[PDB]
Each structure stands twice: as C-alpha cells, then as structure tokens.
Paper text:
In the nucleus of the infected cell, influenza polymerase (FluPol) uses the viral genomic RNA (vRNA) as template to perform synthesis of either capped and polyadenylated viral mRNA (transcription), or unmodified anti-genomic copies (complementary or cRNA), which then serve as the template for vRNA synthesis (replication).
Further refinement focussed on the replicase or hANP32A-encapsidase moieties improved the map quality and estimated resolution to 3.3 Å, enabling relatively complete models to be built. The encapsidase moiety of the FluB replication complex adopts a very similar conformation to that seen in the apo-FluPolB symmetrical dimer. The PA-ENDO(E) is rotated by ~48° away from the PB2-CBD(E) compared to FluPolA, so there is no longer contact with the PA-ENDO(E) 63-73 loop as observed in FluPolA encapsidase. In addition, the lid domain of PB2(E) is also disordered in FluPolB encapsidase, although there is some suggestive, but low resolution, density close to the PA-ENDO(E). In both complexes, the main anchor point remains the C-terminal end of the LRR domain wedged against the PA-C(E) domain in the vicinity of the N-terminus of PB1(E). A critical contact is again made by hANP32A 129-ND, but in the FluB replication complex it is D130 that directly interacts with the Pol II pS5 CTD binding residue PA(E)/K631 (in FluA replication complex, N129 contacts the equivalent PA(E)/K635), with also a slightly more distant salt-bridge to R634, whereas N129 hydrogen bonds to PA(E)/S411. Additional pseudo-continuous density is present in the FluB replication complex maps that we interpret as tracing the path of the hANP32A LCAR extending beyond residue 155, the last of the folded part of the LRR domain, and wrapping around the encapsidase.
Author numbering:
A (entry chain F): 1 to 140, 227 to 300
B (entry chain F): 601 to 743
C (entry chain C): 541 to 678
D (entry chain D): 292 to 716
E (entry chain G): 1 to 155
F (entry chain E): 1 to 227, 239 to 633, 655 to 752
Write the structure that this text describes.
C-alpha cells in the first residue's frame, strides 16, 4: 500500500540518522555496500576477461557525440546503457558495440596515418623486400636482430637478406624470379623442355610476355 | 555425376562443385558401391573444405540471386541456369544411388547418419538433412 | 503416453493374462488377435506398413502352431502386431521382415531374431528385458 | 554418439538430447550392482546419479541440483571434522597429530600396458580443429608447415588426441562452473565434439559429474566432485584395476544388432582450482610431442646439412623411410614407421601429464641422469660414476604407487636388458 | 544336466542325420570337452557352445557342411589348426569371451580360406596396438571381424 | 604388440629423445607440501651441517647463533659448511690477478648505479614480507607501508628520492628505541544481507597504530617469511641485496666461466665455445674429461660470513661508505630469523575434532602428541627456537638471494686450475647452482686425480659437490642447466610453453602480447618453426573462444557474431579484416613482430579503415607494439570500497538496516526502475511512490481520498 509505505517513511524520517543517510547516500552508493557485502576481487586474468566478455556491458565507453551516435538497440541486440556509471563516471557499452562501430560507424579520415606509425611500416616494408636463401642445420646489425626469431635457432640457420628502397631495376628484378620459378616447375616434371617453354610462352609481366622483357 | 546424368536432375551448382574431384582413379568399396561423404576436405585443414550439401567458405551458391561465391569472390551465373533447375532443389545430387521421394516425416525417425546410409539395402527409404531447417526424405535406387 | 510406455504396457498386459492368450492360441481363431488392448498398439505402428507387419506375424504364428513346439518368447514378441488387417503379396504370400521399426525410429525398433532395446529375452537364465526392465518367466 | 549439424549448444541441452536418444539408459531405475568400493556406499551413489539424470532431463535452464540430500550425504561432505579453538586443543589430551599416510608399495600393473597400447591406436574419429595460419614464404616456414602437416596427419585420429580433448574440455567446464557457484552443487556432463573421416560430426556424451561446494575461497582447496562415466568393459576381468570405483550396470547398447552391456563407473574425487588450471593446460601435450618430434628431426638433419623431414617421413631417392623400434612381440623387437613413433610419443606425453605427481617428476628427473650415463656408455665415451648407489637410491625413492612410474621402471628395465644384450655384437 | 540330455532333447530320440544345428549351452563337460557328439554326424550347419568350460579343441566330428560355430565364455587356449583337418568350411567364427594369450594363438586360421567373420571380445589379445590391422594382414581371407571392417551388417 | 616407449632410445640419441620432458619450467601443484614441517626441516638441516662450528648467543637479538667458518675440516664425504677464510681469500686473489682491474671496475660501476638509482626500483619484485602486518604483500604495498611507518617515526628517506637516503633511514630505524607504525585489524560485521534473514556476519578492516620495542623491530626486520623459493625477505633487506647482486653481476659479466646472465642461443654458443676451447689446448695425446656436476644443499651450506668476506675482498679499493653499504647486506643475512609459517594440525578421531596449533604454541603440548618425524624435528629444533614462534638461523641461504655472488664463488673455485702443480688443468662453467667441469690431463687416472683435488678444494670453500647426482665422461657430451650438449647438437630438457588463454588486456593488446610471447619463446627457449606455428594456431583458437570473434564466414551463432557476419558480408577486402572482427588470420613466423593492423593496412577497406582507425572514437578514450584504434577499449576497473570513513560511520549509526529494508521492497518489486546516476535514494523513493500512487489511482486500486492523502505526505517529502 502506498499509504503504509508513506507512513513508514515518515516514521523513519522522525529519526535523524535514517533521514541523513537517505538524504546523502545515493542509489548508486546503495549498490556499493551490497557488492562488498557479497562480492570481492578475483584473479587469473586470462579467465577474468573470459567471464567479463560474456557479460552485458563489460566495456567502458567515452562520453561524446560519437558515443551517442551508435544506437541503443540493433536487430534485437543491446549495445550500451543510458544511465550513468559509478566507476567510469560515464556510459558502459557491450562488446557488440565495438563491432557495430566497425560496421556502420562514422567513417573518419586516416590520411597521414602511416607517418605517425612509420616505424612499423618500415619494418613491414623491410620484411616484404626480403630475399630468403637457404636453410642449414647443425654442424655436428640493427636490421638483423629484429628478425632474429626467424634467422637463427638452436640447430638451424636461415639465410636472410634485408631490403629497403631498392627500386629502379623493377622489370629485371621481376623477370629473374619468374624465370627461376619456371625452372623450379620444370626440373621436377619429366621432360622439362616442353613444359618450360610452355610456361615461358604463357607468362606476362602485367602488360607484356616474358619473352619481350628477356 | 553419373546418377545426375542418368535421371535428369542436372544442377549447375553441384556439377561445378564436384567436377574437379573426378580426376583421380575411382576407389570403390569391397561391395562395389561408391563411398559416401558429407564434406570433402582439402589440404591445409580447417576452412579448406567443400560442403557436399549446403555450402562452404570456398564454395557457396545463392539461387535467389543466382550468385556463385568462390573463396569470397562473387560472380553471376545468368544464362547458365535452367528454369526447372531451382525446383529440383538439392536432394537428388547429394548421395550415390539415392533420390528424393517425399518430405520430413517424424514418424520414420530422426535423420540417418552416413554410417546407416552406407549399410542400407535397396528399396528402403530414409531421411537426411541438407542444412538447418531443410530436411528431406530420400530412397535408395539400384541404378 | 510415449511409445516406450505404450510398448511396455501392451507387453505387460500380454504377460499378466498369459493363460488366456496361450489357451486361445491352440484353438487357432482370429478372435484372440482382435483384442482391444492392441488398438492403442495400432497407433504406434506405421500406417503405410502396419498391415505387412500383421500379415508377417500371422504367417509366422501359423507356422509356429503347425510345424514346431512351444516357444513363449517369440509368441510374446509377435502377438501384438497382428491387430491390423494384413496386406499379402501380389502372388499371395506374406512379406518377410526381420526388423520391425516403430514410431520415432532409431531405438524404437523390435528385432525378430533375438532382441532389441525394447524387447530382449535371454533363455540361458530365462529373463525377459522389456523397455529396460527385467521380468522372470520361471 | 549423437550426430549433429555442427551448431554450438549448452552442455545441459546436449546431455539431455544424448540421453533422449538412448532413452533406455536414462529411464533405468533398478541398478544391477556389479562391484563396490571398500568405503563408498552404492545406494548413495546410485541415488545421486538418479538425481543428476533427473536434473539433466528437466526443463529449467540451470544445471543446479535441487535434491541436495543424497549429494550431501554421498560425498562424505558432512563427515568433516569441526575446528575448535586452539586453547581447548592445547588443554585437551586426546588431540594428537596423526601419522602421515605414506603411499603404499605396489607391483607392476598390467592395465598400464593396455592403456598405452590402445591410446596409441588410430580410431575412426578425430577431435582436433585448429585455426589457419598465414601463407608460408620463408623456407623455415615451409619446413615447419610440412612438419605440422605430417604430425597432424599422423595423430589426427589417434585415440590419445580424443582423450586429451575430453580431459581438457571437462576440466575447462569444471573451472568455468566455479565462476559464481561455489556454495551449490552443479551437474556437468562429460561431453566432447568429434569429427569423423566422412565429415559428419558427432556430439559424444561420456557421462556426468556433480561438483560439490567449496565454502573456503582458497584456490588450493579441494572441492569434492563425484563422476559417473559410462563404459563397456566388465570390471570383473581385471579386479585389481578398479579398487576405487563403484560400478553399476544400466543397460545394453546395440551396434551391429549385437547386445553390449553398459556399466556406470561412479567415483568420488577431490581436486582444487589449481588442479583445474593444470587440467586446462593439459593441452600442452600437443606442443610437447611436436617439440620432441622436431628435436628428433633436427638431430637427423644435423647429421646431414639439409632438412630431413620428408626423407625421414616418406623417404627420398637417396634415403629410405626411417623406422623406429616400437616395442616387443613375443619377446622379439618390432619396428614401425615414424608415424607410430609419433603416436607413441604423444601417448607417452599425455599419460605423463595425466598421471603426474611428485613421484613421477622426481623419477623422471633422476632417470634423466641414468639415461645420460647409459648414452655415454653407448657412445664409447668411457663414463665414470662416483656414487652410483646414491643415484639408484634417489631413483628408487620415487617408485612407490604411481602406475606410470612403475610401468616406466618396468620398460626401463626391459630396454636396459635389450641394450645390454645388443651391445655385445 | 549333461551334453547327453541336450542331445536327446534336441534330437528327440531320432536319427543323428535329422538336425543341422545344435545348442550345447550351460552343459557341464568332463575335463573341458564336447563329448556327446558322435563322429557319425554328417550334416550340420550351425553350432552353439557357451558356458561349456571347453579348454581345448581335440574332439570334433569331421564335417563338410558346417558354416557357423559359436564358442564363448571358455578358458580354451590352444592351436585351432585342427579345424582345417576337421571342417575347413567355416564362415562365421565366434570366440567372444575366450582366453587367448597372444597373436600366435590365432595364427593357424591362415590355412582356412572360407572364414569371413571372426569375433574376439574382451580377449587378452584384443588389447594391443594395431591388433585390428595386424590380424587383418595375418588372415587375408577374412572379410568380417568384430563388426567394423568397413560397415555394419548382421549375421 | 606391447609398446615400449623407451625403445625409441635405441634408434635416437637420448639427448634428442628426452627433449622437452617437462612442459613446465615453473612449479607443479602436487609438489611436496612446503609448510611448517618443511621449513623446520630446512632449518634443522642448515644447523646440522654446521653443528661443529662455534655456537654462541647473539647480544642484540638474543638468539642462538652458529658460525662454522674457519671450523674443523670435514673427515667424511657428508656435506660440510666449514669454509676456511684463507682459501676463499686466495681464490679471490687468483681471480683478481687473472683478471686485472676487474673487481675495481665492477665495484665502481655498482656504486655509480646505486648513486643514480631510485627507491622505486625496489617495487620490481615478487611477494615481499611486510613487517607492519607480518604477512606477504605486493612489493608496492610493502614499500608504501614501510614508508608510511618511517614517516610516522620521523624518517623521511623516501622524500629525498634516492636509494642511499632510504637505506640510511633503514639502518637508522634499526636504532630507534620504540617504533610506531600502522596496521590493519579486522572486526566482525552486523550489517544486513538478504540470504534468509537480512543479516550476515563478515570481517571489515580498519587502520590502527601500534608500537613495538627496539628488539621486536630488530627481530621483525631480519625475519624471513615463507609462502623453488622457500622464503621471502622484507624491505629492510631489499636495497642492500640489490646493490650486492648488481656488484656480483658486474663482476660475472666479464667472467668467461660465468654462465649468467646469458639467455637464448648465446647459451649454446657459450657451451660450444667452452668445449672447443678446452679441446683445442688439450695436451698432445692427452685425455679430456667432463663432469656434469651438481651441488647438494647449495644454499644450506654457503655462509653469509663467507659472502661478507668476498664483498670485503672485492671492494678492497673503494670508498669506505660504499664498502659499508655493500657489507650491510651480508651482516643482515648472517642474523636472519626464519618464520615457521602457520603451524601444525592435531585431530581427535574418537570425538571427530580438529584444531590448528600455531607456531608460538609449537611446544605448548607434550611432544608425545606429535608423530614420530615431527617429534624428532621439534626435539632437534628446541635449542634454535624463540618464544615468538621463530627460529634462529645463522648459516644457510634459503634458496636464491645471492645467486650472482654464488656464481662468483663458484668461478673462484674453478679458477684455481691446479693444485700441487700436477699434470692436470681444470676449467669450466657455473651458473649459480650447477657447474660443468672440464679437466685435461695425460691419462684418465690423472684427470680423476684432478677431479678429486677440485672436489677437495670446493669443499674447502664450502661448495659441496653432489656425488649422488654427478658423472664424468670423455669431453664432447655433457649437460649444463637443463641443456644437453652432444658433439655439436644441443637440446633442452624443460621448455616453458604458452599457457591457455589470452594475456588479459584487450583484443589488439592480447593479440600483440601473444605474438610477442611466441617470438620470445622462439628466440630464447628455442622453439622450432612447426612448434611455433602450432602455438600460433592454439593461441588463435583460444583468442577466438575468449572474445567470441569467430570467422565471419563461419556458421557459429552469437550475440557479437551476427554483426560480425554482417560486416563480413558488406566488406570487400575480406583479407584485410582483423581477426577480432572475424577476419582471416595471416600471422606466421616471418611476421611475428608486426602488428596485425600494420600487416593488413594495405588490404583493408578504406571505409573499414576509417571506421576502425577513427581518430575520435568512444572506445579508446584516454611490453608490446600495437595500433590505437577502436579495438583498444578499456574494461571497467572500479571495485572495493571508497569513502571508507563516511560509509563506516554511517553503517555504525543504527538506522541503516531500516533504510535498506524500505528500499528493498520497492526497488526489487521491479527488476530495474531506479533513476540511478547519483540520485539521492530518498529522491528516487519519492519519485517511485509518486508513480506508484498515480498508477494505483489510474487502475483504480486507490480511491481519490487515498490519492490526495498520498500526494500531501509526498508534498512534505519536498520532491513534489
């Protein structure tokens, strides 16, 4: 009954302590006491995130126009929450929200991104321009340490060479490798002559036959 | 492919999907009956598999738009598809010596695994599942 | 009730009043096969094929009465299937089966030869397992 | 077995469907007791199993037991001693420290040999589906990919792989169930996802297990769990193999029209959260076996100057398919392909992980030194020992009751005899 | 009960050449034999010997029409080569529950060529690596086994 | 065919065959329990091997002290801790002469590093024994508590920032008559909790001030608590041990014999180079022998006094203040007091009772009530026991705390190279617990004479070689720290493998950490290409399971998987999608050091690139290498209790329970109808009751009279 609750609230307000605690403590603070009352901290981070992801809104969310841009629901799937949070002092978002941003989120401008993270792009470019060699097993440089995981082992050695802005002999640098592959395809097959000539006649360096380049 | 050719249920999607595998010399069982499969696995494991009934990441078909998806690339097969091809949906080109005769009948029982299909005898009808929600009823044939 | 429950109840009704059926069997009349208890049993046999089951059961029971001696377990197993009218072959002979499928398929099947998940009688100790439950026949 | 399209479903639903398919076993209410443990009570275990199956077959989403009576009284959870203040114990004269139950001493167990033999066989189903990797360019990547291809092809269908997957999956589920439910009983089916050659995939159920409560928040605290696993082997054949199991007989399956019995091995056990983590990490046996095989291949290639993978697996024109001495047949040595050696290595690693206790690790650590000395003897390096009996005592200090340790000692003795008799040539 | 009683009940005191099958089950035997079956038998197709305590195979009429034989729950452990000299026309063999030590016990079946199915359940020989493959290459004539050669059919 | 795995050894060298026997380099869970019994046994054994030394009573801590140094030489092969000072000094002299200008340079570098270091360095460590509460706490918390106690005791070393003032304040705090500090005390609970009675009992901590006499603090600082480390040391010792270990590391780095701090293939290079060097200078026609020696009771025999002597000899030409700073650590260790842990447990089966006897009351009951082994152990430990549940322990080293100095001492033992000018020369390697010894002579008899001389020499220095775990063989095949070397080939006994699960930071961070862990495992522990690729596969599987980010073209179903599938359908550059978005993984050996964003940039959809790398996205907000995008989100990290004083005084007033009871009914009748967001609970109640009255009147549950009465009461509330 509304009247019963009303009278009980008035009787409680008669006392000063109850009135004070009700006036000061917020609904948000009400949850906190229950937590430590029946909850505590855990360990094992690998499993901790496993549990957290399965929850509804484990991901923190920033406050701004972009945060409100994404919807509350999507095809019967919740994304974020309206009410403010205590810890983050802001909204909380579900994991799916991130995927939504990757699917239908606003398209920003990424111009000049390579400049900011230029070191990683330089590493990738050096790796791409590699010229791998042979691999030799047991007997019985700044640019070399970075790849050491793929160069030297306990009982094996990988012959690897670096690269970096070696452009100019493009066409040549192409034909050779292509030609090499042809031989690699022909030597294994019986009677390599006809197969080799067939593959050489039917190869094009992106505009022209290999014969013209050679 | 021989069963499809004999009784006209020629389906372009199944033909394209299962043509490349026909090279290697046939290897039949001691009974003289061809093996049965649900999906054909290729080298590299995992994704590298072609589904014989529904579709695989390496091969998929959309009859509503008649679009063929190969390794994530989409193409249109207009002009290579017959009007009656859609009606003979899938059930006549998924097993050797089996053809469609009816629909899902819970009374006959649940879906039968390839193990029971291979040991079945001619003139006996069984139930199979193409994909989720599209069961079918088939019958063994001597031919 | 479920199909397993129906099979269990039908076989129990057969077992309890064994004397009546075993006496009527010697006379050799269709009145014993047209019992009310099997009507519900008729619900758990495929309609398209129940008649073949009934004809085969009738033929095997006639052969049992004619050219051999008492065999309680097989009589028990094959009695309930004869309620439905038979459908003889075109020539006039009865259809032959060895696995009587039941509603639900899979495990819901009776074995004519020895036994199955629902029916299995071991003579070495003379014990009849029906729907995962053992009776004695001594 | 219960063939499925391939969708992922909660363990409770999978167990419910599997029991529905084999309805006869689910509806079994009269147990035909076959064997009993020395202390366990058959009635309590059977009633607990009945409660577990009832919970599995119900409709509520939760897998929580509601008939806590038999669960509480069956695992001996009410028989724990009550802690009193230290002052009373000091004053009391009847409270005295108890002697340590040192492990007993046991002879060779014949079932470990059968375990090793069977777990190394190739079955008709595989349970490994690993993700993909980027394209290989460098020669080292090609060599690694070839080694991986050969390894997986050899041990894809090995029964050891399926057992390992069941073990890791069950331990993962046990650990997950301890997330929020600690003061409550939880029913967990021992399920597995398997794939066969034809491509159709099955969802196997190997039994159930009810996990009790662990009021204490410690991670190294035992939480009693009782497991009921199905089996097709009559325990009476090897009475000494199951002195700790309580076994019933639920029903009979039919595979080729032939009736084969089904027993339900019920056993109480105690393990802690760290043991759950160890079981979860038990998937490292794959990497361990792969590293061992790669070390063998690396040694073979180091004899030469070029990789020896394909040659030692399939054989080239110059070389021949390498063969390894596998075991004994009627007391005579038997050879086998490198695939059999890989399977035996994987089975040995899996058994080492499963049967692991302080005795096993100590025995391995000391057998390391003994094996190294034997190797030095083989290579005519003239080894010298200062206190041999010290090493022997250190090794024998660990051979008390572990089945794996005892069988390893037996095999070591056999192999040492073979080496002795073969070194005189 | 004795083998003689079973013989009398099955034959019903008639000529020996009147039944093509026998059921010798739950019958006590003298020192583990199969007495009560005289050599005069000429026609026989099916056999059944379970819980007879048979320890060896040394007494059996010579036959040329038997196609199936069933032995189970016995402690027999010895060479079966004598079957070739007694009846080399077996097609179904059942040794489920028997006591066989090693692979050598099943060797003498090579000389028999008509055998197509062999059963060996919970046998000490069954718990070995590649026992399935080893037996298969040891008995090429075999077309079936415990049930999973390539498929599942019923006898 | 009965398999016999050991038969593999017939066809494969044992060094390769037993490769990676133990997948774990850490500790198993089933190891013999390290409780009070184990520590009692450790102290018993430490005092047993040194019982022939000088026994006296410390005049500071009033505890029994045993000094075996310069004691009688052993007459038996049993372990001995009697290390003559003269032999150690001579060995150090030989090392210094062989390596001129080494000790001086190392000491100078160590003192310079100490001068430039900061107190924060102490926070990089494992669990530390906090004395204020007498428990095991994280390094940062222990340092903070010690700093707070020092501030309360007029000690402000941390304020200056340097480590030297901090250690000066530590040694000064060791002189205060009375030490005051903060401590945590738990008190029971009476606040409501809904299980079946709205009442529960728990423990709440509060901060209190406690003072301790001088002797009590002295004993507490030297205490070593126990949690294959056997014990941990507090903060009063950490700085000095850090400085001494830095000195020892500086010395070792230039010692060719030292096997540390080598890590990776450098270990293999050192092993092969040592073997080749020894074989090269072998006498023409002589014999070279190799011993894979092991040391028993290594840390139960080394004496802190010998370490003090080594530190004094090394820093013979150095500023006096630095000499004292280096010496402060050995003297602290020479007075270490061990803590026996929790205690024992005694039970009565007849009455079904059990109880826990804590360490102070270890001897409070007749010894006849303990089992045989505990009875004997307590009988032997009685002399070295204190009334405060602690055991005096002068000798020993309780596992690794001076590992670098131990390696230096071992190198000194190996540097003698000859005794009596006989026809043998020895050398080898040693890393803080294990040594490989190579001896060149004419015949094996002289080699074994040299090995015996080395054994006696190391006995004189207190190093006890393990006769029960050592063997000798012709050089070319041996072992060194779980690394078998055999005629060029090298294998590992135990290799750490990646553990199940993701690192536990976030999608991109977890992927980067996993890949860098695989790369480091390849570089250091020597993981082969196939093993590394399989580890990549397993990590990808675990990552996908944890983040529910299966392939976009897969047939799995999930809350996130629908959006993933839609994105996969809408995307053209399907090779450029990240794994976290159901894309295809492209990681392999050649690209284990490149972030996946950088790898796939060239293949990403420009619209997908913009969405993923949006400069202002709401997820990122405000080691390993990755890219800051929308996949670098942060999880809510906010728990525990704040506003402790206000909450504690509110809960201690009285009427909190009534407020909770009134709140519960209304705000649990519905799952969530709370206007949360800092709203005062009274305001939320007022709004809830207003809405409830409105609904009751609208549906007719209340008449107009009750309606108006309710609105008047609510009018008094102030929110209407």
């Amino acid at each position: 009954m509304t009247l019963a609750k009303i009278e009980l609230l008035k009787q409680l307000l008669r006392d000063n302590e109850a009135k004070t605690v009700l006036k000061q403590t917020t609904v948000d603070q009400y949850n906190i006491i229950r937590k430590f009352n029946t909850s505590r901290i855990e360990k094992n981070p690998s499993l901790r995130m496993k549990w957290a992801m399965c929850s509804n809104f484990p991901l923190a969310l920033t406050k701004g126009d972009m945060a409100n841009r994404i919807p509350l629901e999507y095809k019967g799937i919740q994304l974020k929450t309206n009410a403010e949070d205590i810890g983050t002092k802001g909204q909380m978002c579900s994991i799916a929200a991130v995927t939504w941003w990757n699917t239908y989120g606003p398209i920003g401008d990424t111009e000049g991104f390579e400049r900011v993270y230029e070191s990683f792009f330089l590493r990738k470019m050096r790796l791409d321009n590699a010229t791998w060699g042979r691999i030799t097993f047991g007997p019985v440089s700044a640019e070399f340490i970075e790849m050491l995981h793929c160069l030297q082992g306990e009982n094996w050695r990988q012959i690897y060479h670096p690269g970096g802005n070696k452009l100019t002999e493009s066409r040549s640098q192409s034909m050779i490798v292509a030609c090499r592959k042809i031989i690699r395809r022909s030597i294994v097959a019986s009677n390599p002559l006809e197969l080799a000539v067939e593959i050489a006649n039917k190869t094009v360096i992106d505009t022209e036959p290999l014969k013209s380049c050679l | 492919l021989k069963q499809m050719r004999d009784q006209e249920v020629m389906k372009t999607d199944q033909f394209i999907k299962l043509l490349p595998f026909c090279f290697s010399p046939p290897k039949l069982r001691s009974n003289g009956e061809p093996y049965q499969f649900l999906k054909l696995v290729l080298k590299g494991g995992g994704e590298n598999f072609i589904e014989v009934r529904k579709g695989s990441p390496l091969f998929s078909y959309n009859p509503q738009t008649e679009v063929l998806t190969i390794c994530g690339r989409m193409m249109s097969l207009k002009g290579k598809i017959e009007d009656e091809e859609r009606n003979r949906s899938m059930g006549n080109a998924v097993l050797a010596g089996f053809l469609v005769s009816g629909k899902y009948d819970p009374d006959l029982g649940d879906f039968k695994t390839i193990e029971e299909l291979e040991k079945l005898k001619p003139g006996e009808k069984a139930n199979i599942l193409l994909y989720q929600g599209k069961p079918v009823k088939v019958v063994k044939r001597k031919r | 009730g479920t199909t397993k429950e129906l099979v269990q109840n039908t076989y129990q009704w057969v077992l309890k009043n064994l004397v009546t059926l075993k006496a009527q069997f010697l006379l050799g009349k269709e009145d014993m096969f047209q019992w009310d208890a099997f009507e519900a049993f008729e619900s758990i046999i495929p309609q398209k094929m129940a008649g073949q089951y009934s004809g085969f059961a009738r033929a095997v029971l006639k052969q049992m009465r004619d050219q051999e001696v008492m065999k309680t377990d097989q009589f028990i197993k094959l009695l309930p299937f004869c309620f439905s009218p038979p459908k003889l072959r075109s020539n006039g002979e009865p259809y032959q089966f060895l696995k009587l499928v039941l509603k639900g398929g899979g495990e819901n099947f009776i074995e004519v030869r020895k036994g199955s998940p629902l029916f299995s009688y071991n003579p070495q100790t003379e014990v009849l397992t029906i729907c995962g439950r053992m009776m004695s026949l001594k | 077995a219960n063939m499925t399209e391939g969708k992922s479903k909660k363990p409770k639903t999978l167990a419910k469907e599997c029991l529905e398919k084999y309805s006869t076993l689910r509806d079994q209410t009269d147990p035909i007791l076959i064997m009993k443990s020395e202390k366990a009570n058959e009635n309590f275990l059977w009633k607990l199993w009945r409660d577990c199956v009832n919970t599995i077959s119900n409709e509520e989403m939760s897998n929580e037991l509601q008939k806590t009576n038999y669960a509480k009284w069956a695992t001996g959870d009410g028989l724990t001693y009550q802690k009193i203040m230290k002052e009373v114990a000091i004053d009391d004269e009847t409270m005295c420290q108890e002697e340590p139950k040192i492990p007993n001493k046991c002879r060779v167990a014949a079932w470990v040999q059968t375990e090793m033999n069977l777990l190394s066989t190739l079955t008709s189903k595989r349970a490994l589906d690993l993700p993909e990797i980027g394209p290989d360019v460098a020669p080292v990547e090609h060599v690694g990919s070839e080694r991986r291809k050969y390894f997986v092809n050899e041990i894809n269908y090995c029964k050891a792989s399926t057992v390992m997957m069941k073990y890791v999956l069950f331990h993962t589920s046990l650990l997950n169930e301890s997330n929020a439910s600690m003061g409550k009983y939880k029913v967990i089916p021992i399920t597995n996802r398997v794939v066969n050659e034809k491509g159709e995939s099955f969802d196997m159920l190997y039994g159930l297990a009810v996990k009790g409560q662990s009021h204490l928040r410690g991670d190294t605290d035992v939480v009693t769990v009782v497991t009921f696993e199905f089996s097709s082997t009559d325990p009476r054949v090897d009475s000494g193999k199951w002195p700790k199991y309580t076994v019933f007989r639920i029903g009979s399956l039919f595979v080729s029209g032939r009736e084969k019995s089904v027993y339900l091995y019920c056993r109480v056990n105690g393990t802690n959260k760290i043991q759950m983590k160890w079981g979860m990490e038990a998937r490292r046996c794959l990497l361990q076996s792969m590293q061992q095989m790669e070390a063998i291949v690396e040694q073979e290639s180091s004899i030469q100057g070029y990789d020896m993978t394909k040659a030692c697996f399939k054989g080239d024109r110059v070389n021949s398919p390498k063969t390894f001495s596998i075991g004994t047949q009627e007391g005579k040595l038997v050879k086998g392909s490198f695939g059999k050696a890989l399977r035996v290595i994987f089975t040995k690693c899996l058994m080492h992980y499963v049967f692991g206790n302080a005795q096993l690790e100590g025995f391995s650590a000391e057998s390391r030194r003994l094996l190294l000395l034997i190797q030095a003897l083989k290579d005519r390096k003239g080894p010298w020992v200062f206190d041999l009996e010290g090493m022997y005592s250190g090794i024998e200090e660990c051979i008390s009751n572990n089945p794996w340790v005892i069988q390893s000692a037996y095999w070591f003795n056999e192999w040492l005899g073979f080496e002795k008799e073969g070194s005189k040539v | 009960m004795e083998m003689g009683r079973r013989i009398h009940l099955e034959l019903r005191n008639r000529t020996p050449s009147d039944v093509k099958e026998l059921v010798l089950d739950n019958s006590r035997s003298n020192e583990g034999k199969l007495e009560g079956l005289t050599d005069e038998f000429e026609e026989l197709e099916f056999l059944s010997t379970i819980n007879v305590g048979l320890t060896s195979i040394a007494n059996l009429p010579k036959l040329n029409k038997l196609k199936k034989l069933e032995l189970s729950d016995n402690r027999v452990s010895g060479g079966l080569e004598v079957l070739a000299e007694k009846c080399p026309n077996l097609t179904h063999l059942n040794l489920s529950g028997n006591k066989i030590k090693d692979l050598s016990t099943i060797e003498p079946l090579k000389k028999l060529e008509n055998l197509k199915s062999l059963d060996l359940f919970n046998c000490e020989v069954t718990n070995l690596n590649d026992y399935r493959e080893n037996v298969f290459k040891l008995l090429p004539q075999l077309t079936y086994l415990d049930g999973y050669d390539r498929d599942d059919k019923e006898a | 065919m009965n398999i016999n795995p050991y038969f593999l050894f017939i066809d494969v060298p044992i060094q390769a065959a037993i490769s990676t026997t133990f997948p774990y380099t850490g500790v198993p869970p089933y190891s013999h329990g390290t409780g009070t019994g184990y520590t009692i046994d450790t102290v018993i054994r430490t005092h047993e091997y040194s019982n022939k030394g000088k026994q006296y009573i410390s005049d500071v801590t009033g505890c029994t002290m045993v000094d075996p140094t310069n004691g009688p030489l052993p007459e038996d092969n049993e372990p001995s801790a009697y290390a003559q000072l003269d032999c150690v000094l001579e060995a150090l002299d030989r090392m210094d002469e062989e390596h001129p200008g080494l000790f001086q340079a190392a000491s100078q570098n160590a003192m310079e590093t100490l001068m430039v270091t900061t107190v924060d360095k102490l926070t990089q460590g494992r669990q530390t024994f906090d004395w204020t509460v007498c428990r095991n706490q994280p390094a940062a918390t222990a340092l903070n508590t010690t700093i707070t106690s020092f501030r309360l005791n007029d000690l402000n070393g941390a304020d200056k920032g340097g480590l030297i003032p901090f250690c000066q304040d530590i040694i000064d705090s060791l002189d205060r008559p009375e030490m005051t500090f903060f401590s945590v005390k738990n008190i029971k609970k009476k606040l409501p909790a809904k299980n079946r009675k709205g009442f529960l009992i728990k423990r709440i901590p509060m901060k209190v001030k406690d003072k301790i006499t001088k002797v009590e603090y002295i004993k507490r600082a030297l205490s070593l608590n126990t949690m294959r480390a056997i014990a941990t040391a507090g903060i009063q010792i950490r700085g000095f041990v850090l400085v001494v270990e830095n000195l020892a590391k500086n010395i070792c780095e230039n010692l060719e014999q030292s096997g540390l701090p080598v890590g990776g293939n450098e270990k293999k290079a050192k092993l092969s180079n040592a073997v080749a060097k020894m074989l090269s200078n072998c006498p023409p026609g002589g014999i070279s022998m190799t011993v894979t020696g092991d040391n028993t009771k290594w840390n139960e025999c080394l004496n802190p006094r010998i370490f003090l002597a080594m530190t004094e000899r090394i820093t013979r030409d150095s500023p006096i203040w630095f000499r004292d700073f280096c010496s402060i650590a050995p003297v602290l260790f020479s007075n270490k007091i061990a803590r026996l842990g929790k205690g024992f447990m005694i039970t009565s089966k007849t009455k079904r009772l059990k109880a826990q006897i804590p360490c102070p009351d270890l001897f409070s009951i007749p010894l006849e009530r303990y089992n045989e082994e505990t009875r004997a152990k307590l009988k032997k430990l009685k002399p070295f026991f204190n009334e405060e549940g602690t055991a005096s322990l002068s000798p020993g080293m309780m596992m690794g705390m001076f590992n670098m100095l131990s390696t230096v001492l071992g190198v000194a033992a190996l540097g003698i190279k000859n005794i009596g000018n006989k026809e043998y020369l020895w050398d080898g390697l040693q890393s803080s617990d294990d040594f490989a010894l190579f001896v060149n002579a004419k015949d094996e008899e002289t080699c074994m004479e040299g090995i015996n001389d080395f054994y006696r020499t190391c006995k004189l220095l207190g190093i006890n070689m393990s006769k029960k775990k050592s063997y000798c063989n012709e050089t070319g095949m041996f072992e060194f720290t779980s690394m078998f070397y055999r005629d060029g080939f090298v294998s590992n006994f135990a290799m750490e493998l990646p553990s199940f699960g993701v690192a536990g930071v976030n999608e991109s961070a977890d992927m980067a950490i996993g890949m860098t862990i695989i790369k480091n495992n390849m570089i250091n522990n020597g993981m082969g290409p196939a093993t590394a690729q399989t580890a990549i596969q397993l990590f990808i599987a675990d990552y996908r399971y944890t983040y529910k980010c299966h392939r976009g073209d897969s047939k799995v179903e999930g809350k996130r998987m629908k959006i993933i599938k839609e994105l996969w359908e809408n995307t053209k550059g399907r090779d450029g999608l990240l794994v976290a978005d159901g894309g295809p993984n492209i990681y392999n050996l050649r690209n284990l050091h490149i972030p996946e964003i950088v790898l796939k940039y060239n293949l990403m959809d420009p619209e997908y690139k913009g969405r993923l790398l949006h400069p202002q996205n709401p997820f990122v907000g405000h080691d390993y290498d990755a890219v800051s995008g929308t996949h670098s989100w942060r999880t809510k990290r906010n728990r525990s209790i704040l506003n402790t004083d206000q909450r504690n005084m509110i809960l201690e007033e009285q009427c909190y329970a009534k407020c909770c009871n009134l709140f519960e009914a209304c705000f649990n009748s519905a799952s969530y109808r709370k206007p949360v967001g800092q709203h005062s609970m009274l305001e939320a109640m007022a709004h809830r009751l207003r809405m409830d009255a409105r609904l009751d009147y609208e549906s007719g549950r209340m008449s107009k009279d009750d309606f108006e009465k309710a609105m008047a009461h609510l009018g008094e509330i102030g929110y209407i």
